[PDB]
């Protein structure tokens, strides 16, 4: 629902083609006709609102903890988190 | 000196041109005045193949390094009317070049058709390329990313000898102007170095057991960093007895294989 | 004027023998103008001798 | 600091000194645009060596004068952002067909800032202008480029044929002498145009001005070093031909690198202070 | 350092050996016997202690 | 480009153009303010036809320098836009006697924005200041006037008369000439005043500035558009009298309306270029 | 601007009055630095009462010129904050051997602020450059003193000693005269430097400029006031001997203490407006 907006409709086909299949416990499963709707729209609003009010509550050190950690110590968990952090 | 020489500001040199400020600046650690052209990596590797594999294996740690005082030597040999006055007998020409240079050029380099002056003046033309005095340089290099994994703060000390010569034996006539400087695991011979300083000759004559070439007579405290060197005692243990054979020359190269994890993964694929 | 600077450089510093005339030596005849400029750094007389030595070698290098 | 030359009489020496004192105020600041000044070197009149040497001194003193003036862009670079911020507040109230599409352009316009390097400076000038002209065209409902990878060319909007032909003479005359610009008597404002359009037009003008100054300056700067190596490579061939004390002295001066115009400064200062010694190597008269 | 290298040898004090200098003189069959006093320094192949 | 006057000697034409080229530097930038310039036209000395034509040339050229200099308070406008936003963060924290009565003024303050039309800006600041200058009165629990039809005279609160007199003479000197604003040395904040009130004053200052410049500019332009229309209205009468080819030619040049200053610039650009053909119409000396 | 003197010859008064208008232009801006001007004052040509009074006029007028040429660092002082934030812009990205120590220096660099009052900045600069250079050395891994109570000297990093001479000579010519600024010392090399050092050196030069000007003005005022307050005491003790009206008028003027910025400027006007009347007391010629 979040990716659907702000993306070209052809890109959305490629994403939904894979977001629907789930390999939990070695079995695969597929969501039956997942469709963007109003029922997802109100949840889009509540998720973007809570997730944006989260951004304006973390302390100066709470956000900085990862930078502080990677500059001093490294492990496998930290490698992928260095990736999701885009650039620096 | 006490601070790294990285700043490109501190390095420059001028050749073929009058540099009185540089010539006076001799004997100063500061601006080292390094020649323009830098060694390409491939011949940089050949230098390490030669001085670090070939020479210690063919000399068995008998070699030693030493610098010449050019300031008082070149002014001593040259600076005679015979060389200041140059156009664009056999003994009367000996006087012209002097007793100091006659010992060097008389038999070593002169043909029956080239007089002593026509031979020794060819030497004079190399005076225009003179560089600084002998000086030692430290090289504080951290190890590569494949090896700096454990102990990241390690930094490898080196003690290369800028502007120096390898020395098979003590110079007989330049003995007034030579400067013995043992610095390396090899190139630290007591027999050469004691011939050039009473300070080291008394040291060895009180301590005869340091005469030994194998594990050197203890180098200066500046130069005695056994653990931070790249090449530790087994290298001189090996070069001390190894037969001066080509395969005993190559085997130092096989002693030089790194213990990187990438060195291990690469070396093992070869079935070495 | 400067003729005294040139004599002071030829004799106090370079200590050239009287047989080495300033007029005779052209490669010295040009360098005197340059050594006169560097009025400092006259304390080390061993540098100017080797500099003039290498300039004389500059004078006669065919290669 | 004083330049030196070999063959020329003091009249032409003073002519070049005056040519160099008045460089910024001279139109067409390009030595290759003044062939008579290079003829002043006395080509075909003096020896090949002296011609080459007075030319090398001309190029070295010219490049040194370029570095000496070195056109600063501090005030216009800040005026460009001050001008840029205007279009955002002019466009907020305006109604668009798809306000999100234009909010993207206002956001591209409002995050504009200049990196310390002079290299990245021209790119912001172009990205903001692409974001602004497209905005002004959405303001007029005019056709927009749609093909992938295609972009609207930066061009003034709703301005007369004579008026753009007139401002382009100015923007071109910036290229031939960057250090000084004369602001147009004509003002880009129009009573018929929307205020956003006028702000966009003034923004495009400052952007094209910054781009014309930057590109021409870097072009001259690299061209000077190209001619300098061109000269030193030939001059060494000339000096090798006749060995003597002084001919062999200039070669040992020329052995050094030519890159990095501070190195050209080094070569010029070492070449001047040691001029007295090799002046006789070059034939004159 | 080059100039003052004779100054080091004026002191007649004998210089104590490092450990890995003392570690080499053992034969390959005697390196493992208890008489080796440097056995605890060989903790790890890739890192000398 | 080259203004053309019939019976005016170069001593006076040079004066008339020197009056224009330095207009940003003179106090009291009004053509009527300087009556000597109106006398340089040759009125009561030249014939009426030539008198009206020289007055008309002066008015078109003065209007042109107005359109050219064209004040643009953007750099101050953004500072005003920031200070208004700070005023609400100050007014929200400070306890009020009436939570809801001040809610109206604070929401009015949140709604400020600058319309795509420049002309609306002076209104916005006005509705901005009624939003604030009243509110600060509630800040001190002062009893502000509530009689209908008077709103609230704009005024600085809790300030020295020495300071308000100086700031008033500053706003007046900006009022007469709006281009070379002189930066103040005054520090409008006072530690004695409430922290909110220092912000209200630093807001009201820039608000008065933007209002005064926009009002004075519109006031000059609204007058010149009447002046040129009067000059053409009187000059077409004089030109009707002569049937000479050039006398009909000038009436055809005057046919176009002077409204929309763009036409005031077009008429001048045209009236210069064809000056040679009809100059025969007007008597000389 | 209406200075007068008692016994000086008119040609000598010309040089002293012209010294006011050419003050800032010349090097060595200090009244003692020019002894000729003080021999011009009238020692041994005029009586002691005339000499001590003449020096009052010169010192009050010199203090007046110094305040007219009010040295105004705020234009450069704003740019210092741009350069300092630009230094932190690279302190974060740059890797260090130990970062948890340099983080303290980056935080301490973020602290720097400019008070509207001048007198504290010569402290803040020192708090920054020491924190900045301790950073910059760690860029190139310079050996750092650990001995407690030691401050690293403030010096340019990786700038050639001949370059450092040329830049510190300009700083010394700044300490000679705060009004004249020649930031023409830009020879830094593109290749020879690293990302931090390129900006650390320019920040150090701007901080040395700001502090040198602040200290130079402070020295000038410190000497001016102590000199004026002593000349007033000498003259007041001098006129006590006379009884005649014209002399007592002077003591009645000089009772007022000169200690203030505004009090010397009030005393000089009050001592100038009433010059016609008390000049009789001081013997002249």
Coordinates of C-alpha atoms in Angstrom, one line a residue, chain F residues 70-210:
Chain F
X70 CA 12.0 48.5 -9.8
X71 CA 12.5 47.9 -6.0
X72 CA 12.4 44.3 -4.9
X73 CA 12.2 43.8 -1.2
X74 CA 12.8 40.0 -1.5
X75 CA 15.8 39.8 0.9
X76 CA 13.8 41.6 3.6
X77 CA 10.6 39.9 2.6
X78 CA 12.0 36.5 3.6
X79 CA 13.1 37.9 7.0
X80 CA 9.6 39.2 7.5
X81 CA 8.2 35.9 6.6
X82 CA 10.4 34.2 9.2
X83 CA 9.7 36.8 12.0
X84 CA 5.9 36.4 11.5
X85 CA 6.4 32.6 12.0
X86 CA 8.4 33.2 15.2
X87 CA 5.8 35.6 16.6
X88 CA 3.2 32.7 16.9
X89 CA 5.7 30.4 18.7
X90 CA 6.1 33.3 21.2
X91 CA 2.4 34.0 21.5
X92 CA 1.4 30.4 22.0
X93 CA 3.5 29.9 25.2
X94 CA 2.6 33.1 27.0
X95 CA -0.6 32.7 29.1
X96 CA -3.5 34.9 28.0
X97 CA -6.5 36.2 29.8
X98 CA -8.7 34.8 26.9
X99 CA -7.5 31.6 25.3
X100 CA -10.1 31.8 22.5
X101 CA -10.1 35.5 21.7
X102 CA -6.4 35.3 20.8
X103 CA -7.0 32.2 18.8
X104 CA -8.5 34.2 16.0
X105 CA -5.4 36.4 15.7
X106 CA -3.0 33.5 16.0
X107 CA -4.8 31.6 13.2
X108 CA -4.8 34.8 11.1
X109 CA -1.1 34.8 11.7
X110 CA -0.7 31.2 10.6
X111 CA -2.5 32.0 7.4
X112 CA -0.1 34.6 6.1
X113 CA 1.4 33.9 2.7
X114 CA 2.4 36.1 -0.3
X115 CA 0.2 35.9 -3.3
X116 CA 1.5 35.5 -6.9
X117 CA 0.5 39.1 -7.4
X118 CA 3.1 41.4 -5.9
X119 CA 0.3 44.0 -5.3
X120 CA -1.4 41.9 -2.7
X121 CA 1.7 41.8 -0.6
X122 CA 1.1 45.2 1.1
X123 CA -2.4 44.0 2.0
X124 CA -1.1 40.8 3.6
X125 CA 1.4 42.6 5.8
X126 CA -1.5 44.9 6.8
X127 CA -3.7 42.0 7.8
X128 CA -0.6 40.6 9.3
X129 CA 0.0 43.6 11.6
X130 CA -3.6 43.9 12.7
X131 CA -3.1 40.3 13.7
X132 CA -0.1 41.1 15.9
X133 CA -0.1 44.7 17.1
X134 CA -3.5 44.1 18.7
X135 CA -2.4 40.8 20.2
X136 CA 0.7 42.3 21.9
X137 CA -1.7 44.7 23.7
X138 CA -3.4 41.7 25.2
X139 CA 0.1 40.6 26.1
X140 CA 0.5 43.5 28.6
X141 CA -3.2 43.3 29.6
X142 CA -3.5 46.8 28.1
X143 CA -7.0 47.8 27.2
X144 CA -6.9 48.2 23.4
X145 CA -9.6 50.3 21.7
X146 CA -12.6 48.4 20.3
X147 CA -14.6 51.2 18.7
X148 CA -16.0 50.2 15.3
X149 CA -14.4 51.4 12.1
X150 CA -10.9 52.1 13.5
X151 CA -9.3 48.7 13.8
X152 CA -6.0 49.5 15.5
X153 CA -3.5 52.2 14.5
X154 CA -0.2 50.4 13.9
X155 CA 2.3 51.4 16.5
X156 CA 5.4 50.2 18.4
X157 CA 4.6 49.2 22.0
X158 CA 6.7 49.8 25.2
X159 CA 9.4 51.8 23.4
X160 CA 11.4 54.9 24.1
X161 CA 10.1 58.0 22.3
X162 CA 13.8 58.7 21.5
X163 CA 13.7 55.3 19.7
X164 CA 10.3 55.6 18.0
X165 CA 11.1 59.0 16.7
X166 CA 14.3 57.7 15.2
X167 CA 12.7 54.6 13.7
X168 CA 9.9 56.9 12.3
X169 CA 12.3 59.2 10.6
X170 CA 14.0 56.1 9.2
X171 CA 10.7 54.8 7.8
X172 CA 10.0 58.2 6.3
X173 CA 13.4 58.4 4.6
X174 CA 12.6 55.0 3.2
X175 CA 9.2 56.3 2.2
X176 CA 10.6 59.1 0.0
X177 CA 13.3 57.0 -1.6
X178 CA 12.8 53.3 -1.6
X179 CA 15.9 51.9 -3.4
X180 CA 18.9 52.7 -1.2
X181 CA 17.6 51.6 2.2
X182 CA 20.1 52.4 4.8
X183 CA 20.8 49.6 7.3
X184 CA 20.2 50.6 10.9
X185 CA 22.7 50.5 13.7
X186 CA 19.8 50.2 16.2
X187 CA 19.2 47.0 18.1
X188 CA 15.4 46.9 18.3
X189 CA 15.5 44.4 21.1
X190 CA 15.6 45.6 24.7
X191 CA 16.2 43.2 27.6
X192 CA 13.8 45.4 29.6
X193 CA 11.0 44.5 27.2
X194 CA 9.1 41.2 27.3
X195 CA 10.8 38.5 25.2
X196 CA 7.6 38.3 23.0
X197 CA 7.5 42.1 22.6
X198 CA 11.1 42.3 21.2
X199 CA 9.9 39.9 18.6
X200 CA 6.7 41.9 17.9
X201 CA 8.9 44.9 17.3
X202 CA 11.4 43.2 15.1
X203 CA 8.3 42.0 13.1
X204 CA 6.5 45.4 12.9
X205 CA 9.7 47.1 11.7
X206 CA 10.1 45.0 8.5
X207 CA 6.3 45.1 8.1
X208 CA 6.3 48.8 8.1
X209 CA 9.3 48.7 5.7
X210 CA 7.6 46.4 3.1

